[PDB]
Scaffold this active site. Sequence first.
Site, short mmCIF file in Angstrom:
data_model
loop_
_atom_site.label_atom_id
_atom_site.label_comp_id
_atom_site.label_asym_id
_atom_site.label_seq_id
_atom_site.Cartn_x
_atom_site.Cartn_y
_atom_site.Cartn_z
N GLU A 69 -8.09 9.15 -4.35
CA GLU A 69 -7.88 10.39 -3.83
C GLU A 69 -8.27 10.27 -2.65
O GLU A 69 -9.09 11.19 -2.36
CB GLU A 69 -9.04 11.38 -5.12
CG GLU A 69 -8.29 11.73 -6.66
CD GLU A 69 -9.01 12.90 -7.20
OE1 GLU A 69 -10.11 13.00 -6.85
OE2 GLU A 69 -8.17 13.61 -8.15
N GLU A 145 -7.22 8.32 -15.34
CA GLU A 145 -7.73 9.30 -15.56
C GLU A 145 -6.44 9.55 -16.49
O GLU A 145 -5.37 10.36 -16.36
CB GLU A 145 -8.02 10.32 -14.75
CG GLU A 145 -8.83 8.96 -13.82
CD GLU A 145 -9.59 10.42 -12.43
OE1 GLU A 145 -9.23 11.50 -12.54
OE2 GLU A 145 -9.54 9.28 -11.25
#
EC number: 3.2.1.23
Lengths: 211, 210
Positions: A69, A145
């Site tokens: 991220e 994820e």
Amino acid sequence: PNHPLWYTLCDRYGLYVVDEANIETHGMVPMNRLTDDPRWLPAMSERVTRMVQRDRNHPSVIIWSLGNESGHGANHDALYRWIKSVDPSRPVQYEGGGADTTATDIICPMYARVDEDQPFPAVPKWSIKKWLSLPGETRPLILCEYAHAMGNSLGGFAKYWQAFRQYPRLQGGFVWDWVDQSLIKYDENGNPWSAYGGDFGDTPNDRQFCM
Amino acid sequence: RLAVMVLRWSDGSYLEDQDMWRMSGIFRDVSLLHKPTTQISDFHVATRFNDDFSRAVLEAEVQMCGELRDYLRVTVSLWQGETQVASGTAPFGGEIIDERGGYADRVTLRLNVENPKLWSAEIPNLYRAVVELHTADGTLIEAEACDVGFREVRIENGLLLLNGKPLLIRGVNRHEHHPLHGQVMDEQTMVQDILLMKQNNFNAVRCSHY
Ligand SMILES: [Mg+2]
Ligand code: NA
Ligand code: NA
């Protein structure tokens, strides 16, 4: 990068490991503000290069990750190529900037759904079945994820596994995540209880999202 | 007097095992065609485009049979309704292609077309190409012609593109069948089929299987 013993235990017990550089700049606006900035390249490089130097002899490590991220910046492309140059033995992956950038060997989205598209501007999360066959796309897809296990959750988990088994290039994923990040606090009687965001006077906080 | 002996079964039947009624006979048109001794024996029309389809080149390769002479010419003219948009004239004798030379009995005409109206199933824009075989000094020997649709079909990056855009084929397979006339087709039936197809949002047909 984890405590060094973790990799020894994964070598010996037998688990495949994605080793991930300690780089996350999620709160920047936009997310790649630092990772596209060459003045931050030295700092980022050390987090990638010193990880590889430490962990490269562990058989359990099968994939290197550039972090998490942090959008997609030119610093990612540079460090992707550094790893490919020094260690051709392991694929390099990175999810930032839309999960299928030039800085990743594996399409590695987070929370892309099985059949349903989420067409966000610039960084869409395609249906994983659709993603594989986008014009020109050839890479394997492994979700970095998926199946966010917050509280009473994992609804639709079987839908992922049906798709993984049916599609050769859907090669699985990493559930988010293993263990609740709750902390122990004590009441007036000394009895322990599980605490989350905000319970230590911490503010701003994100409450139960740590579990 | 013509005499035609038609066999129901032949070695060709081994290549004609389509899922359909097995019939036989003279089931399409019969015609008589007069051509001059010196004649157009073949012609091919191609249309190539620049990146944004604002410029096109129409390339027409024309082949002759018969009496090959220096006075011979081909003129290809391109029409949009009553307006001539492009024209080219050349003698026979194609480019050198190998050690033995070129096709003395062929000519390739290249016509520049600015901002061509493009053909699609959505807007079937057509031009008319007229191919004139003639003497240089102006005697038409014969003319052939065809409808020209300016379009590019290509597969790029895994997609079938028409004029640069990805198609969505709303198709149907269509056999040539009439409940009374069998496998004989008429204009009225063909038009009826095309109208119904388009009225029902079809844009494509497969000639199953011939
Ligand atoms: Mg069959
Ligand atoms: Na699979
Ligand atoms: Na969380």
